[PDB]
Design a protein around this ligand. Sequence first.
Ligand SMILES: COc1cc(NC(=O)C[C@@]2(C)C[C@H](c3cccc(Cl)c3)[C@@H](c3ccc(Cl)c(F)c3)N([C@H](CS(=O)(=O)C(C)(C)C)C3CC3)C2=O)ccc1C(=O)O
Length: 105
Amino acid sequence: MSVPTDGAVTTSQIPASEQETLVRPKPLLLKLLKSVGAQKDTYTMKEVLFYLGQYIMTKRLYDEKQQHIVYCSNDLLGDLFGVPSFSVKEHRKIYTMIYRNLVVV
Ligand SMILES: COc1cc(NC(=O)C[C@@]2(C)C[C@H](c3cccc(Cl)c3)[C@@H](c3ccc(Cl)c(F)c3)N([C@H](CS(=O)(=O)C(C)(C)C)C3CC3)C2=O)ccc1C(=O)O
């Protein structure tokens, strides 16, 4: 990972320009972002990933760091993504699940 600002996280697995994609989260995704301090309705993807990461850690969905698995089956995030769990290493898979929950500007 890289952290180009205090509210963004990027990855070499995804093109840099893709992480600058402007998006308008649908209501559930937006709710999760605002629960950890987000104050707007439009974001770059790298900001969405930052806030989703904060949400995951705040809800204690990634306690076992070395296992690299988020367990979200009983959380809003599991409903958002439509999976019971996923790997924090699989960044394209994560981007794909997020894209289903937003409109691209
Ligand atoms: C790809 O290979 C690896 C990946 C990893 N780990 C990751 O890629 C996970 C990552 C470091 C980036 C990992 C990340 C970062 C940028 C983009 C993407 Cl798609 C993923 C990122 C993350 C953020 C949001 C979501 Cl929804 C998610 F599932 C995972 N998170 C966040 C923490 S954070 O990076 O935001 C930090 C607080 C440390 C700045 C954790 C809470 C979910 C990570 O911890 C570890 C080891 C290896 C290896 O084999 O060497």
